Curated annotation (Swiss-Prot), chains A, B:
Residues 6-122 form the ADF-H domain. This is Cofilin/actin-depolymerizing factor homolog 1. Not involved in actin polymerisation, instead functions to stimulate nucleotide exchange on monomeric actin and influence turnover of the small amount of cytosolic actin microfilaments. Essential for erythrocytic schizogony. Its main location: cytoplasm. The keyword Cytoplasm applies. It comes from Plasmodium falciparum (isolate 3D7).
Length: 122, 122
């Protein structure tokens, strides 16, 4: 069996995600794992997705995270893991990605991990 | 806050530990973390502590673990982490050591992490 499993999304994640989707009071949310729970790290107003990831790149408090970004036509969801992140941290974020995806609906799930702002130049 | 926390010792760990202490049906137990719970990896008959750690050294299924060894005069408890183990795995085993120590009583807690059989030549 795996060392880490059964990590859970707290209700507040779904609450704020729905605030974003329905009430449009923010344009992005960053989720992290703390105390074996997925919680909200921060949220804010959408400029561009590139600008969001640039901010994340410069914020060393964030090693890995799940991110949603309201691009209006779609809400993108992705895992972020900076190149310098620890492989074992990446493994637990990877395995817990399914947990947050079960709790939030209506997102476009990106097919690649985002490591830096270069990766979102699509 | 920390990524991982609140890892719990399942009842069976205490049950078997007491079997060892009271009924002397084994002389050592190896505990690991699986699915965010501390469980029993294996148990067996005591030869020497050096021989136990030599076996652990050769068993690649074990990266880190908590170990108890009945030396008759004392029951030693220690964390094992092979030199090649991952630093983040060591961190979560380290932080969860207090959890198993609260559940088991009457052990001599070693002051150093054991990395190989050389470390127990005391």
């Amino acid at each position: 069996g795996s060392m880490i499993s059964g990590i859970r999304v707290n209700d507040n994640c779904v609450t704020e995600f729905n605030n974003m989707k329905i009430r449009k009071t923010c344009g992005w949310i960053i989720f992290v794992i703390q105390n074996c729970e997925i919680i909200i790290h921060s949220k804010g107003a959408s400029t561009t997705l590139t600008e969001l990831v640039q901010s994340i790149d410069k914020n060393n408090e964030i090693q890995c995270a799940y991110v949603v970004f309201d691009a209006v036509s779609k809400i993108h969801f992705f895992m972020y893991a900076r190149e310098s992140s620890n492989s074992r941290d990446r493994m637990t974020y990877a395995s817990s990605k399914q947990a947050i995806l079960k709790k939030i609906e209506g997102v476009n799930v990106l097919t690649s991990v985002i490591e830096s702002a270069q990766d979102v130049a699509d």
